[PDB]
Scaffold this active site. Structure first.
Site, mmCIF file in Angstrom:
data_model
loop_
_atom_site.group_PDB
_atom_site.id
_atom_site.type_symbol
_atom_site.label_atom_id
_atom_site.label_comp_id
_atom_site.label_asym_id
_atom_site.label_seq_id
_atom_site.Cartn_x
_atom_site.Cartn_y
_atom_site.Cartn_z
ATOM 1 N N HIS F 194 0.832 -1.202 0.000
ATOM 2 C CA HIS F 194 0.000 0.000 0.000
ATOM 3 C C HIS F 194 0.858 1.239 0.000
ATOM 4 O O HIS F 194 0.396 2.318 -0.354
ATOM 5 C CB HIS F 194 -0.911 -0.004 1.224
ATOM 6 C CG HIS F 194 -1.811 1.186 1.312
ATOM 7 N ND1 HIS F 194 -2.500 1.678 0.226
ATOM 8 C CD2 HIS F 194 -2.145 1.974 2.359
ATOM 9 C CE1 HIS F 194 -3.216 2.722 0.598
ATOM 10 N NE2 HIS F 194 -3.020 2.921 1.889
ATOM 11 N N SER F 198 -0.913 -0.885 -6.098
ATOM 12 C CA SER F 198 -0.810 -2.039 -6.982
ATOM 13 C C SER F 198 -0.364 -1.648 -8.377
ATOM 14 O O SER F 198 -0.430 -0.482 -8.751
ATOM 15 C CB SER F 198 -2.147 -2.765 -7.049
ATOM 16 O OG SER F 198 -2.551 -3.199 -5.766
ATOM 17 N N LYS F 220 -15.855 -7.371 -7.590
ATOM 18 C CA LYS F 220 -15.050 -8.251 -8.417
ATOM 19 C C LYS F 220 -14.547 -9.372 -7.533
ATOM 20 O O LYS F 220 -14.779 -10.543 -7.815
ATOM 21 C CB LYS F 220 -13.872 -7.521 -9.039
ATOM 22 C CG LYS F 220 -14.240 -6.603 -10.190
ATOM 23 C CD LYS F 220 -13.542 -7.035 -11.469
ATOM 24 C CE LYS F 220 -13.718 -6.004 -12.570
ATOM 25 N NZ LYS F 220 -13.178 -6.475 -13.875
ATOM 26 N N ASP F 221 -13.873 -9.020 -6.444
ATOM 27 C CA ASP F 221 -13.302 -10.035 -5.571
ATOM 28 C C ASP F 221 -14.367 -11.002 -5.081
ATOM 29 O O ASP F 221 -14.088 -12.188 -4.909
ATOM 30 C CB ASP F 221 -12.594 -9.369 -4.395
ATOM 31 C CG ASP F 221 -11.212 -8.860 -4.758
ATOM 32 O OD1 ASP F 221 -10.901 -8.784 -5.967
ATOM 33 O OD2 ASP F 221 -10.440 -8.520 -3.840
ATOM 34 N N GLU F 264 3.552 -34.557 -3.843
ATOM 35 C CA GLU F 264 2.321 -34.041 -4.407
ATOM 36 C C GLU F 264 2.610 -33.171 -5.612
ATOM 37 O O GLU F 264 3.721 -32.672 -5.773
ATOM 38 C CB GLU F 264 1.552 -33.276 -3.343
ATOM 39 C CG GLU F 264 0.068 -33.141 -3.627
ATOM 40 C CD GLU F 264 -0.717 -32.739 -2.396
ATOM 41 O OE1 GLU F 264 -0.140 -32.764 -1.289
ATOM 42 O OE2 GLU F 264 -1.910 -32.400 -2.535
HETATM 43 C C1 HEM Z 1 -3.945 -23.264 11.340
HETATM 44 C C2 HEM Z 1 -4.557 -23.762 10.270
HETATM 45 C C3 HEM Z 1 -4.514 -25.206 9.989
HETATM 46 C C4 HEM Z 1 -4.856 -26.230 10.805
HETATM 47 C C5 HEM Z 1 -5.348 -26.114 12.204
HETATM 48 C C6 HEM Z 1 -4.655 -27.437 10.106
HETATM 49 C C7 HEM Z 1 -4.932 -28.667 10.707
HETATM 50 C C8 HEM Z 1 -4.770 -29.849 10.020
HETATM 51 C C9 HEM Z 1 -5.015 -31.130 10.570
HETATM 52 C C10 HEM Z 1 -5.495 -31.462 11.980
HETATM 53 C C11 HEM Z 1 -4.742 -32.018 9.578
HETATM 54 C C12 HEM Z 1 -4.844 -33.517 9.693
HETATM 55 C C13 HEM Z 1 -6.257 -33.999 9.371
HETATM 56 C C14 HEM Z 1 -6.604 -33.632 7.954
HETATM 57 O O1 HEM Z 1 -6.882 -32.449 7.669
HETATM 58 O O2 HEM Z 1 -6.606 -34.507 7.060
HETATM 59 C C15 HEM Z 1 -4.327 -31.302 8.432
HETATM 60 C C16 HEM Z 1 -3.984 -31.889 7.234
HETATM 61 C C17 HEM Z 1 -3.552 -31.138 6.149
HETATM 62 N N1 HEM Z 1 -3.385 -29.813 6.053
HETATM 63 FE FE1 HEM Z 1 -3.720 -28.588 7.418
HETATM 64 N N2 HEM Z 1 -4.194 -27.170 8.885
HETATM 65 C C18 HEM Z 1 -4.089 -25.842 8.736
HETATM 66 C C19 HEM Z 1 -3.665 -25.078 7.659
HETATM 67 C C20 HEM Z 1 -3.277 -25.644 6.470
HETATM 68 C C21 HEM Z 1 -2.886 -24.908 5.358
HETATM 69 C C22 HEM Z 1 -2.822 -23.401 5.318
HETATM 70 C C23 HEM Z 1 -2.587 -25.825 4.365
HETATM 71 C C24 HEM Z 1 -2.105 -25.519 3.011
HETATM 72 C C25 HEM Z 1 -0.869 -25.050 2.870
HETATM 73 C C26 HEM Z 1 -2.812 -27.125 4.904
HETATM 74 C C27 HEM Z 1 -2.646 -28.307 4.232
HETATM 75 C C28 HEM Z 1 -2.959 -29.536 4.813
HETATM 76 C C29 HEM Z 1 -2.832 -30.775 4.046
HETATM 77 C C30 HEM Z 1 -2.377 -30.903 2.618
HETATM 78 C C31 HEM Z 1 -3.197 -31.764 4.874
HETATM 79 C C32 HEM Z 1 -3.255 -33.232 4.566
HETATM 80 C C33 HEM Z 1 -4.673 -33.497 4.065
HETATM 81 C C34 HEM Z 1 -4.974 -34.971 4.019
HETATM 82 O O3 HEM Z 1 -4.955 -35.647 5.070
HETATM 83 O O4 HEM Z 1 -5.256 -35.517 2.931
HETATM 84 N N3 HEM Z 1 -3.302 -26.970 6.168
HETATM 85 N N4 HEM Z 1 -4.388 -29.958 8.701
HETATM 86 C C1 HEM Z 2 0.564 -15.915 1.209
HETATM 87 C C2 HEM Z 2 0.115 -15.790 -0.032
HETATM 88 C C3 HEM Z 2 -0.129 -14.458 -0.597
HETATM 89 C C4 HEM Z 2 -1.187 -13.643 -0.379
HETATM 90 C C5 HEM Z 2 -2.359 -13.944 0.514
HETATM 91 C C6 HEM Z 2 -0.974 -12.466 -1.144
HETATM 92 C C7 HEM Z 2 -1.896 -11.419 -1.140
HETATM 93 C C8 HEM Z 2 -1.717 -10.283 -1.894
HETATM 94 C C9 HEM Z 2 -2.610 -9.202 -1.947
HETATM 95 C C10 HEM Z 2 -3.926 -9.079 -1.232
HETATM 96 C C11 HEM Z 2 -2.074 -8.285 -2.781
HETATM 97 C C12 HEM Z 2 -2.679 -6.960 -3.147
HETATM 98 C C13 HEM Z 2 -3.692 -7.110 -4.272
HETATM 99 C C14 HEM Z 2 -3.161 -8.080 -5.284
HETATM 100 O O1 HEM Z 2 -3.136 -9.298 -5.017
HETATM 101 O O2 HEM Z 2 -2.738 -7.665 -6.382
HETATM 102 C C15 HEM Z 2 -0.849 -8.784 -3.257
HETATM 103 C C16 HEM Z 2 -0.030 -8.101 -4.120
HETATM 104 C C17 HEM Z 2 1.168 -8.644 -4.532
HETATM 105 N N1 HEM Z 2 1.719 -9.813 -4.209
HETATM 106 FE FE1 HEM Z 2 0.952 -11.099 -3.102
HETATM 107 N N2 HEM Z 2 0.181 -12.563 -1.814
HETATM 108 C C18 HEM Z 2 0.753 -13.745 -1.534
HETATM 109 C C19 HEM Z 2 1.947 -14.299 -1.975
HETATM 110 C C20 HEM Z 2 2.784 -13.629 -2.838
HETATM 111 C C21 HEM Z 2 3.992 -14.125 -3.339
HETATM 112 C C22 HEM Z 2 4.584 -15.478 -3.048
HETATM 113 C C23 HEM Z 2 4.527 -13.150 -4.158
HETATM 114 C C24 HEM Z 2 5.791 -13.213 -4.911
HETATM 115 C C25 HEM Z 2 5.943 -14.064 -5.918
HETATM 116 C C26 HEM Z 2 3.631 -12.056 -4.139
HETATM 117 C C27 HEM Z 2 3.838 -10.905 -4.838
HETATM 118 C C28 HEM Z 2 2.897 -9.888 -4.842
HETATM 119 C C29 HEM Z 2 3.115 -8.675 -5.627
HETATM 120 C C30 HEM Z 2 4.309 -8.356 -6.482
HETATM 121 C C31 HEM Z 2 2.051 -7.897 -5.419
HETATM 122 C C32 HEM Z 2 1.794 -6.556 -6.027
HETATM 123 C C33 HEM Z 2 1.009 -6.925 -7.285
HETATM 124 C C34 HEM Z 2 0.644 -5.719 -8.096
HETATM 125 O O3 HEM Z 2 0.070 -4.759 -7.549
HETATM 126 O O4 HEM Z 2 0.897 -5.696 -9.317
HETATM 127 N N3 HEM Z 2 2.599 -12.355 -3.296
HETATM 128 N N4 HEM Z 2 -0.616 -9.983 -2.647
#
Ligand code: HEM
Ligand code: HEM
Ligand code: HEC
Ligand SMILES: COc1c(O)c(C)c(C/C=C(\C)CC/C=C(\C)CC/C=C(/C)CC/C=C(\C)CC/C=C(\C)CCC=C(C)C)c(O)c1OC
Lengths: 238, 76, 21, 64, 44, 373, 98, 48, 38
Positions: F194, F198, F220-221, F264
């Protein structure tokens, strides 16, 4: 290895559900033929109610297998009759027992036999009907029958479905195939007790998004029309 | 914030109220031509890399199969 | 000055009852 | 009568299976006949088998 | 870059010293026990 | 009001470019996906047990006995897949339109990308299937590559001689705690942006044409959220296992290793690179660089135009880069045998040569064509 | 080379939005110093051209073919002003180097 | 002593360097000392 | 417009009421469609 071919299953349908008579027939098959060596641990008599059997039919089915409770004042292995809350029986007490009663091989729990296999249900059917005479030039050790589909084509499991192996209570001819298709549907059933339900949620979901998306887009186009009609003009004072 | 973003001069800007204008003016009337206009300005930059990805993917698959296919001359 | 050019025509956009709209 | 055999019966009649089997037939003969070769029809059998099963499944369920 | 050169010299010792400090800290915190070992002190 | 001022300052009266396409939706989608994951993760945490005797049993109990527990579990898994889809498209938007010149935003982004990959890896270890256990051992082993302190580090993480309960429980704790750090890093990501606003697809200074965000880029979003929810629910309710592996539905057997071990899909590109380099260490490093090369990206911009809208040769090189990224995703899947290996080796060579060498040289040539250089 | 430069000018596509070449430069510090040194009329035409290009990109349209920017006609107005910024910039840098 | 300040404290880095070295040695002494003190304190009641 | 689209308050009421009925209606129709498909 030979990839199992795609079969025209009903449940494979996108909006199609599982044929529940086939799940009932496939549960019979397990009960009679494949239960003695494989283990449906994650499936319990309770899960069947409302799918294949009623409450009293599943209660009778559960009362057909005794279980062990062992909380007696002294009795520690007390063997009860079993109930609905009880899970499906186990073939062998422990992994070793499995190796012992199966020529060293471990019969995997079928609780999720299909979700496990990559080929999916198809694979199970392919093999169930895939026992085949070994192509000239190969031999196996014990109960191993060249099965093209099985990895290595050497499955310890002997061919368990001989035509008319068991009689379907419904009376549908118990041909080997009719039995393999029923048990593949059933094994599918256990692996996903909500196939049908998930699909009902997917139907309503589609419809809901089907009404929300167009509308939201319209709004996206109301609130963006203003700009999309904006006409800019440059008027240097000149 | 707004008010201090930029300095423009003499740029008049006309507009209409949302409810006063058709929601989808000539949507398919010009939309199609435009979408098609767009695709022809970007297709030569975008498509041929994915075309040769498709050829390499098929090639790899078939080549792999041939690789797996037993050598008839061998074992004889 | 400020009168020489008129509002550009939005007819195309114009949805040529307001309550209904 | 096993519906499976029946379906297979017909599909095997398909020239595809016919020819595929022919190759496999030559294969088994060669495998058994040639001492020098330690090869088998696992490699070719599944070719034929695949074809057969393919068409069989294509219509097998119709019976079931 | 003459100016840069001169300034570098000025910072060289202090820079190295800070690096030295980190190195010392690293060995101590990590309890290297290999660099420390030869050192009179012995953990045991 | 000091709480409503920040909300107004970042979502209502924020001056946004009027001409940003649908690709600019994707980052907001990522934030929504993050919440969705957190919410679904919380409802997995009320029934999951991080014990090696009971983890698979707890997952099956979630799928079979908890009311709509299968829905929340498969929403969590396919939402992780949707998170990586939106992440890859967000990074591709940043690479194509020259948004990496916002250097602090880009670096906080690549930190977020590393954190999300670590979170997804430990989450995939969490159900304690056959595939999870062999996958964990594999990547944990990756660390052993470290020249001197590798063995110790691996053993530390494992918490023992080999991954076992010690790992599962600490992986549950770390997988729980990292998405909140991801949320805080995303707040820092939004702040560092900000300050600069953007970017637009033309790559020009859009200060003359900016509009509010509430009525123009909010609906839009909302529409993008609705479309992403449509794709997520048709992934969950119709094809719940097209992206996962079947071998994860078997319990973890240390005595048997699934013959075909594949990480994966969204890790595949990296997997390919790792496999390509003959040296173990080389693979690990290249793998890391694969992700890190992006951070290095803002120092490789040698053009006088920010975006690729008016740059056709670098557009061709960009789509060749997307092409061999898809090729590396495919190769990872393929087993170790000819000619998958050679493609992998080339594809990795072409990937690093296009990002490192070909794009700045092409930008110099493009500046020469416009009589600028 | 002249005809191939015209073909590349058509393939770049900023003439279809009515932009000049110098409108498409990324605003670094030197570019913003060169823009600040522009006369008022050239700056106002540049801002109107950028605003019109942003509006056309918003509606996903281009100008009619008679209104495009002819390669021959494009004027490199910012260039003269820019060179100076770079020259001055380098001079200052050199002074510091020495 | 001015020497200390002039040599060890004047340069911020040295200020850190001395602290670093001191830390490296403090542990040894403090640990051993406290250990023995403790040992003496519980002279007879221990595993030995 | 003169009943549910004049002032925000009126708009709110119809939303609540309509949603109240649409829920059941949607499920009911889904029943037919779902059963129809299966
Ligand atoms: C704080 C937030 C989160 C909590 C509390 C959480 C909790 C869990 C728990 C308890 C499991 C095992 C049971 C199941 O889901 O199958 C799990 C599996 C998994 N979580 Fe998360 N998770 C979180 C955030 C995320 C996020 C952000 C991602 C993505 C990057 C993610 C990807 C996965 C995947 C790929 C599995 C395996 C799924 C499967 O069993 O086939 N989780 N999560
Ligand atoms: C955790 C995952 C991410 C979230 C939730 C996120 C979220 C956002 C949000 C809300 C914005 C402002 C509006 C927009 O998306 O254009 C933004 C902008 C941007 N993000 Fe991310 N972002 C993430 C990961 C990344 C990563 C990994 C990169 C680098 C490769 C990245 C690079 C950017 C850039 C360069 C902008 C400015 C885009 C523009 O205004 O042209 N972000 N992001
Ligand atoms: C009396 C013994 C016995 C009966 C009856 C039996 N099985 Fe098995 N089964 C085994 C043994 C032993 C194994 C392990 C063999 C191996 O893995 O090599 C096995 C393994 C399997 C596998 C694993 C294949 C794979 O991909 O690894 C499937 C699927 C299977 N059985 C399905 C069935 C079905 C379906 C039935 C009946 C409708 C059945 N079995 C009846 C003994 C039996
Ligand atoms: C320039 O225009 C903007 C903009 O200013 C902002 C703030 C966002 C951020 C809004 C979102 C809905 C994305 C999510 C934002 C967060 C802060 C995520 C918070 C979630 C956590 C779990 C923390 C945008 O997505 C966006 O472009 C459309």
């Amino acid at each position: 290895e030979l990839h199992p071919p795609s079969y025209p299953w009903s449940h494979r349908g996108l909006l199609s559900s599982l044929d529940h008579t086939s799940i009932r027939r496939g549960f019979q098959v397990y009960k009679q033929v494949c239960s003695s060596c494989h283990s449906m641990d994650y499936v319990a008599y309770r899960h069947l109610v409302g799918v294949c059997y009623t409450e009293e039919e599943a209660k009778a089915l559960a009362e057909e297998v005794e279980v062990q409770d062992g909380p007696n004042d002294d009795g520690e292995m007390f063997m009860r009759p079993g109930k609905l809350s009880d899970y499906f029986p186990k073939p062998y007490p422990n992994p070793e027992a499995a190796r012992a009663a199966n020529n060293g091989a471990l019969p995997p729990d079928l609780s999720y036999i299909v979700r496990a296999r990559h080929g999916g249900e198809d694979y199970v059917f392919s093999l169930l009907t895939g026992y085949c005479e070994p192509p000239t030039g190969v031999s196996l050790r014990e109960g191993l029958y060249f099965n093209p589909y099985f990895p290595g084509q050497a499955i310890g499991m002997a061919p368990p479905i001989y035509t008319e192996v068991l009689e379907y209570d419904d009376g549908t001819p118990a041909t080997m195939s009719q039995v393999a298709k029923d048990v593949a549907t059933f094994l599918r059933w256990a692996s996903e007790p909500e196939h049908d339900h998930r699909k009902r949620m997917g139907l309503k979901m589609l419809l809901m998004m089907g009404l929300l998306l167009p509308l939201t887009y319209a709004m996206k186009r109301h609130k963006w029309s203003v700009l999309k009609s904006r006409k800019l003009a440059y008027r240097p004072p000149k | 914030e707004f008010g201090n973003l930029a300095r423009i001069r003499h740029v008049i800007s006309y507009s209409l109220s949302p409810f006063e204008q058709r929601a989808f003016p000539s949507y398919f009337s010009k939309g199609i031509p435009n979408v098609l206009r767009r695709t022809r300005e970007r297709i030569l930059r975008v498509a041929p890399p994915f075309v040769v990805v498709y050829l390499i993917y098929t090639w790899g698959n078939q080549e792999f199969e041939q690789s797996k296919r037993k050598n008839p001359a061998m074992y004889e | 000055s400020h009168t020489d050019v008129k509002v550009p025509d939005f007819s195309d956009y114009r949805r040529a009852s307001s309550e209904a709209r | 009568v096993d519906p499976l055999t029946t379906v297979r019966e017909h599909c095997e009649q398909l020239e595809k299976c016919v020819k595929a089997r022919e190759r496999l037939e030559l294969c088994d003969n060669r495998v058994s006949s040639r001492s020098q070769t330690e090869e088998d029809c696992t490699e070719e059998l599944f070719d034929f088998l695949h074809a057969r099963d393919h068409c069989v499944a294509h219509k097998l369920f119709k019976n079931l | 870059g003459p100016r840069y050169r001169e300034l570098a010299r000025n910072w060289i010792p202090t820079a190295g010293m800070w690096g030295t400090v980190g190195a010392v800290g690293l060995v101590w915190a990590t309890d290297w026990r290999l660099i420390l070992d030869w050192v009179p002190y012995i953990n045991g | 009001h000091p709480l409503f001022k920040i909300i107004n300052h970042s979502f209502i009266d924020l001056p946004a470019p009027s001409n940003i396409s649908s690709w600019w939706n994707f980052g907001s989608l990522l934030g929504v996906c993050l919440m969705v994951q957190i919410i679904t993760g919380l409802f997995l945490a009320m029934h999951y047990t991080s014990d090696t005797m009971t983890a698979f049993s707890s997952v099956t109990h979630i799928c079979r006995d908890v009311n709509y527990g299968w829905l929340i579990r498969y929403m969590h898994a396919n939402g992780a897949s949707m998170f990586f889809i939106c992440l890859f498209l967000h990074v591709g938007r940043g690479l194509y339109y020259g948004s990496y010149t916002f250097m602090e935003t880009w670096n906080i982004g690549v930190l977020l990308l590393f954190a999300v990959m670590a979170t997804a890896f430990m989450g995939y270890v969490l159900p304690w299937g056959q595939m999870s256990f062999w996958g964990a051992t594999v990547i944990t082993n990756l660390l052993s590559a470290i020249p001197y302190i590798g063995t110790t580090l691996v053993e530390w993480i494992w918490g023992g001689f080999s991954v076992d309960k010690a790992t599962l429980t600490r992986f549950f704790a770390f997988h729980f705690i990292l998405p909140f750090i991801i949320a805080a890093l995303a707040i820092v990501h939004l702040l560092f942006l900000h300050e600069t606003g953007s970017n637009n697809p033309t790559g020009l200074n859009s200060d003359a044409d900016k509009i509010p965000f509430h009525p123009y880029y909010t609906i839009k979003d909302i529409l993008g959220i609705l479309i992403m929810f449509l794709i997520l629910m048709t992934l969950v309710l119709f094809f719940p296992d097209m992206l996962g592996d079947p071998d994860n539905y078997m319990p973890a057997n240390p005595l048997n290793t699934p013959p075909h071990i594949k990480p994966e899909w969204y890790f595949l590109f990296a997997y390919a690179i790792l496999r390509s380099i003959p040296n173990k260490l080389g693979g690990v490093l290249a793998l890391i660089l694969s992700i890190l090369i992006l951070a290095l990206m803002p120092f490789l911009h040698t053009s006088k135009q920010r975006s690729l809208m008016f740059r056709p040769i670098t557009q061709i090189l960009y789509w060749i880069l997307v092409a061999n990224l898809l090729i590396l995703t495919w190769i990872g899947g393929q087993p170790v045998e000819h000619p998958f290996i050679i493609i992998g080796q080339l594809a990795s060579i072409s990937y690093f040569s296009i990002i490192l060498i070909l794009m700045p040289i092409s930008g110099i040539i493009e500046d020469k064509m416009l009589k600028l250089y | 080379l002249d005809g191939f430069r015209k073909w590349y000018y058509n393939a770049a596509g900023f003439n279809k939005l009515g932009l000049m070449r110098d409108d498409t430069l990324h605003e670094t510090e030197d570019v913003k110093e060169a823009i600040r040194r522009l006369p008022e009329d050239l700056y106002n035409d540049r801002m109107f051209r950028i605003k019109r290009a942003l509006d056309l990109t918003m509606r996903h349209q281009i100008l009619p073919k008679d209104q495009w920017t002819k390669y021959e006609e494009d004027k490199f107005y910012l260039e003269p002003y820019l060179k100076e910024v770079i020259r001055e910039r380098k001079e200052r840098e050199e002074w510091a180097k020495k | 002593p001015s020497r200390l300040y002039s040599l060890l404290f004047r340069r911020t880095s040295t200020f850190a360097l001395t602290i670093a070295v001191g830390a490296l040695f403090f542990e040894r002494a403090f640990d051993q000392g406290a250990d023995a003190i403790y040992e003496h304190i519980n002279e007879g009641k221990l595993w030995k």
